């Protein structure tokens, strides 16, 4: 009899290529037509290409321009050259003949199947990250498997990714600090994590508690991040202990032509240890301290984070508020650098709010046990961090393993020391709109619009 036996499935990196052959026991001269048919789970037969003995080809219009369909009677073979692959081709891809009888009827002849998967790993963290260092991981898990990583740092993913990834693919894991997780759990934009004990075992029991929203765990911990007083050593040996001492120094320094202090007062999370500092009475305090520092022309207006970045680099401003993630530019730069406690207010410290780096799941992903794989035995291992650290730091990793590499770098006690003087952002839903009442309530008071009186009027509703 006559049997089609299809070959050449397997995996690939979209935009690679993949060629199906399908050989008959029987002469192709005798068939009318050949062609292939696709099926993705759960979905109908769909054809994608076929040959007629005329010598014409018809194809599907998703294909159309990407496969062609060839024929080699002399190997008794019909060939799909899949070429530029895309997610959406994914599915077992089938081999079809149809022959005319002798007689007015045909013969419908079909093969076993040949699965062809096209997989992408994508992920979405932050622009200020290392993102060149965990695609060094992504590299290394590619040799070992087989499947892309690609590397993805899209402005304003925090509120991109729950758009996104409700209704279109969005990324398979996201990365951000675990305050913005419980309002993705509490949506269903994350799946469930269940890493077995031994993996468990290998992160410190504190940080898995910042990624658990309603007893499940929605997230993978990787490091803790506090901001600190970054200052050049050359133009400041002694900095400022106090906040309060920190416009006499900016008249000294506005002298010799150079700033005091240069920080991102755009963002929230680099105003708010001064809000916190007391404390409301407390938040009326530090505010005004902030909008003085404005009013007396010490600080600009609209200070963002890379003109603060640039302008410490550079050697123009003594101090900086900023996390781990920076440190990595100052050393390009040739600035001797150190960080510090934050400076002090009402003699009270300045609470930072203390943000643990974590890896979540999108649920609406195909790829999650290939994401988990990835997380685990390559992201989350020693190796693994070794590498995004080496492009921009971490922080203070949540590994056991790094406690003794942690503990030998100065920075990293500062940053700890900060993180003990502030507090780990609650996780909840309500995080979002806190964060942008606080958002507009700064931005106000430092344009001058709104008094600080009525900015923790309009911000506490
Ligand atoms: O600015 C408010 C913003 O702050 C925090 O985001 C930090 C992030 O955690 C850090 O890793 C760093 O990259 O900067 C961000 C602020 O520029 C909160 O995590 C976030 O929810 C909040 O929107």
């Known amino acids: 009899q006559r049997q089609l036996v299809e070959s050449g499935g397997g995996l690939v990196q979209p935009g690679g290529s993949l060629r199906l052959s399908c050989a008959a026991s029987?002469?192709?001269?005798?068939?009318?037509?050949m062609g292939w048919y696709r099926q993705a789970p759960g979905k109908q037969r769909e054809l994608v290409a076929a040959?007629?003995?005329?010598?014409?080809?018809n194809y599907a219009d998703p294909v159309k321009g990407r496969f062609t369909i060839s024929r080699d009677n002399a190997k008794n073979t019909v060939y799909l050259q899949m070429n530029s692959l895309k997610p959406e081709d994914t599915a077992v891809y089938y081999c079809?003949?149809?022959?005319?009888?002798?007689?007015?009827?045909?013969?419908?002849?079909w093969g076993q199947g040949t699965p062809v998967t096209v997989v992408k790993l994508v992920i979405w963290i932050n622009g200020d990250k290392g993102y060149n260092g965990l695609a060094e991981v992504g590299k290394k898990f590619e040799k070992d498997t087989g499947i892309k990583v690609t590397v993805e740092h899209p402005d304003k993913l925090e509120e991109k990714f729950p758009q996104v990834a409700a209704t279109g693919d969005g990324p398979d894991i996201i990365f951000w600090a675990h305050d913005r997780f419980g309002g993705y759990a509490q949506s269903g934009l994350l799946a469930e994590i269940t890493p077995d004990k031994a993996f468990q075992d290998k992160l410190y029991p504190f940080t898995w508690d910042a990624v658990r929203y309603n007893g499940k765990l929605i997230a993978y911990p990787i490091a803790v991040e506090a901001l600190s007083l970054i200052y050049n050593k050359d133009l400041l040996p002694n900095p400022p202990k106090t906040w309060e001492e920190i416009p006499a120094l900016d008249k000294e320094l506005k002298a010799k032509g150079k700033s005091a202090l240069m920080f991102n007062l755009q963002e929230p999370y680099f105003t708010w240890p001064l809000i916190a500092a007391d404390g409301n009475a407390g938040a009326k305090a530090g505010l005004t301290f902030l909008v003085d520092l404005i009013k007396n022309k010490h600080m600009n207006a609209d200070t963002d984070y890379s003109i603060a970045e640039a302008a410490f680099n550079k050697g123009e401003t003594a101090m900086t508020i900023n996390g781990p993630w920076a440190w990595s530019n100052i050393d390009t730069s040739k600035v001797n650098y150190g960080v510090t406690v934050l400076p002090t207010f009402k003699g009270q410290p300045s609470k930072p709010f203390v943000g643990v780096l974590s890896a979540g799941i999108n649920a609406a992903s195909p790829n999650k046990e290939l994401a988990k794989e990835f997380l685990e035995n390559y992201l989350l291992t020693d190796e693994g961090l070794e590498a995004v650290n080496k492009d921009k730091p971490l922080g203070a990793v949540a590994l056991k393993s790094y406690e003794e590499e942690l503990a030998k770098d100065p920075r990293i006690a500062a940053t700890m020391e900060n993180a003990q003087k502030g507090e780990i952002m609650p996780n909840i839903p309500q995080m979002s709109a806190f964060w942008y009442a606080v958002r507009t309530a700064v931005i106000n008071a430092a344009s001058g619009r709104q008094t600080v009186d009525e900015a923790l009027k309009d911000a506490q509703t």
């Open positions: 079809n003949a149809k022959e005319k009888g002798w007689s007015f009827s045909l013969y419908d002849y």
């Open positions: 029987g002469s192709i001269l005798y068939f009318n037509r």
């Open positions: 040959i007629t003995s005329g010598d014409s080809t």
